[PDB]
Amino acid sequence: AGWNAYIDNLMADGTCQDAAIVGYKDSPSVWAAVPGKTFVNITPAEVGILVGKDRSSFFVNGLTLGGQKCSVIRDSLLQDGEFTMDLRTKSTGGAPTFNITVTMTAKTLVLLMGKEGVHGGMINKKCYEMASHLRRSQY
Amino acid sequence: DDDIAALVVDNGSGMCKAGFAGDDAPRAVFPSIVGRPRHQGVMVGMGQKDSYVGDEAQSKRGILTLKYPIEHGIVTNWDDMEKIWHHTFYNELRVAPEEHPVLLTEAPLNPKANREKMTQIMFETFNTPAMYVAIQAVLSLYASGRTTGIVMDSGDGVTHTVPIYEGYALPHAILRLDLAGRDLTDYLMKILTERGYSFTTTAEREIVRDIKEKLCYVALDFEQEMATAASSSSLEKSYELPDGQVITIGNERFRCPEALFQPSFLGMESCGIHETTFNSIMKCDVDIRKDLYANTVLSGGTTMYPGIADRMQKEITALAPSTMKIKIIAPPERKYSVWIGGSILASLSTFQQMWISKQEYDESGPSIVHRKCF
Numbered sequence A: 001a002g003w004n005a006y007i008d009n010l011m012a013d014g015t016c017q018d019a020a021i022v023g024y025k026d027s028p029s030v031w032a033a034v035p036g037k038t039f040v041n042i043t044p045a046e047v048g049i050l051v052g053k054d055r056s057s058f059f060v061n062g063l064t065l066g067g068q069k070c071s072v073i074r075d076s077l078l079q080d081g082e083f084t085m086d087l088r089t090k091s092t093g094g095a096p097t098f099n100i101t102v103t104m105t106a107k108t109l110v111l112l113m114g115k116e117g118v119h120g121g122m123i124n125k126k127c128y129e130m131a132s133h134l135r136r137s138q139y
Numbered sequence B: 001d002d003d004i005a006a007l008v009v010d011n012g013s014g015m016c017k018a019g020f021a022g023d024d025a026p027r028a029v030f031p032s033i034v035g036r037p038r039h040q041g042v043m044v045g046m047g048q049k050d051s052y053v054g055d056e057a058q059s060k061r062g063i064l065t066l067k068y069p070i071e072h073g074i075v076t077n078w079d080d081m082e083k084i085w086h087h088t089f090y091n092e093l094r095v096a097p098e099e100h101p102v103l104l105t106e107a108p109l110n111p112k113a114n115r116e117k118m119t120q121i122m123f124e125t126f127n128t129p130a131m132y133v134a135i136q137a138v139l140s141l142y143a144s145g146r147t148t149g150i151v152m153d154s155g156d157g158v159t160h161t162v163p164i165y166e167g168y169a170l171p172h173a174i175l176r177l178d179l180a181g182r183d184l185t186d187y188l189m190k191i192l193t194e195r196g197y198s199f200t201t202t203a204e205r206e207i208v209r210d211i212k213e214k215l216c217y218v219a220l221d222f223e224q225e226m227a228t229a230a231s232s233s234s235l236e237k238s239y240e241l242p243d244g245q246v247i248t249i250g251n252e253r254f255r256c257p258e259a260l261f262q263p264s265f266l267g268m269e270s271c272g273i274h275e276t277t278f279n280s281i282m283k284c285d286v287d288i289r290k291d292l293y294a295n296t297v298l299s300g301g302t303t304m305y306p307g308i309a310d311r312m313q314k315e316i317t318a319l320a321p322s323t324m325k326i327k328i329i330a331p332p333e334r335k336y337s338v339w340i341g342g343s344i345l346a347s348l349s350t351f352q353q354m355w356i357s358k359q360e361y362d363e364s365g366p367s368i369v370h371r372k373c374f
């Protein structure tokens, strides 16, 4: 049923613990997400920073994804062919951290967060594969 | 045989380190050269192996047109960079690449196309079941049992500073400096040649180098060691040439390594080892910085100069805010750190829920590296 279909599809693995489809085109809005998690709370200010003008400041300060302080690792969100940006959450004292990869499409931003011990490459390929499906349906 | 046996291949610009994942040392260290037979005029024949490689082509020399395939960590020629790989399996470990997964090692800032090329080759050409490309510096930090930190890699042709967050290199803050072994060798020569020690070349450049590895140390205070140098004699060391004299260096011992911290010594405008390390860190996220400053690992031959730790420990402390604990970590085995790192990485069951499988190369192609390998 709706965008919720793509989500269920994204978590069905047991590897991810959060997904979300967010429209960034001039009126940010989560189109569907794992409920009761973090991405569901992504705000327009936050989304306005990922799809930003400068691709440098967040390297120093960082950025939150639903109030979650994330450290950018690689940034290729605006670069053709790639379409991906990779992040690692920022815990506190032994608290475990998780990788997140947001991939842009014509209209959407596909976010994906791994569980405990899932390598970023996994989460990237996966979030990437899905973004290409929307990307081919003019989405 | 009695298990999956993943392999590790740490590709140095000079020395190639092969081995089976799970070992104590590269179970094969050979030069990275490909001799391409010759003589000229165009002859009566030449014979076997249109290309000789490794330790064998090394003797050959006078008969073969010796070639260096990798420069500054970066692959220069795939034809002969393939030969070295081919050899590693079919000549060194004597394994059929077809049955062993493999970790390939790479340089910070390896161009995209090089990555893909490396991928298409391992899969289409050697038919590896699965592989994974890891940055040489990340593996070194693992070798010292860490995941977050900053590696100062100094081999022969260049130095890089790689701030790593949880096992992920942060490219935006990776810094590269054109000083490393070679430079220290050319300086020392130029500085030994002062009392007309004139080594220069007649196979005499390798003597400077052996002095460098054997007699150079690093000063905690240049000026003051300089003053005590001039006051003389428990700092003046001698060296025996092959055929001949017992030579003497003094000021020279702690002067060549000092160009690391002072590249104007080498006529070059450039920040030193210390400030470079510092610059990378500033480029990082404010929240991890304090954990980079207390995890500056050293790897590479050029880091082996005794005293480099303390001079490092002291020099960064004056550049940085007091709020953190500068703690230069410099592992005793920092020459083989990189291989040992990947040996450890390619030993874990996780390496399997981490790599590119042939199936994946068939569905996606070489571009699958920009995805999986970070």
Ligand SMILES: Nc1ncnc2c1ncn2[C@@H]1O[C@H](COP(=O)(O)OP(=O)(O)OP(=O)(O)O)[C@@H](O)[C@H]1O
Residues within 6 Å of the ligand: B012, B013, B014, B015, B072, B073, B154, B155, B156, B157, B158, B180, B181, B182, B209, B212, B213, B214, B300, B301, B302, B303, B304, B305
């Ligand atoms: N024990 C030592 N003390 C001081 N300097 C050393 C020592 N061992 C090696 N070196 C020097 O530091 C460098 C070591 O780098 P390394 O052995 O990694 O080089 P390589 O494989 O020839 O090339 P590249 O580093 O460009 O990949 C060389 O220039 C070497 O002369």
Ligand SMILES: [Ca+2]
Residues within 6 Å of the ligand: B012, B013, B014, B015, B155, B156
């Ligand atoms: Ca080297």
